[PDB]
């Protein structure tokens, strides 16, 4: 029964339609955020330094 459920869900998700919006791999995105956050922090730091100057 669970195999039939899985195959029907696979068919439904394959048939499902979405507007053309890019959506990156589920596992990696979180890591990217962390890096992005750090980037902003660094940028902010540099910005502060620039303003300080």
């Amino acid at each position: 029964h669970l195999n039939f459920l899985k195959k029907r869900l696979l068919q439904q998700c394959e048939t499902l339609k979405v507007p053309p919006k890019k959506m990156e791999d589920l596992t990696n995105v979180s890591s990217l955020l962390n890096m992005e956050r750090a980037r902003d922090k660094a940028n902010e730091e540099g910005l502060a330094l620039l303003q300080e100057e």
Partner: protein, 52 residues
Amino acid sequence: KKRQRMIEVQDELLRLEPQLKQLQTKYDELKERKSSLRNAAYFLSNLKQLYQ
């Protein structure tokens, strides 16, 4: 935009930096000239009085 701001502020600083020096030396030399010429006028008048 902050990097451009860097560009204009550094340009203004490097332009204004030399401007102080010539004005300072001109002020100093003119003040020295004034003091020297006032002294010299005093001495020439005093020596003329001595001669008379």
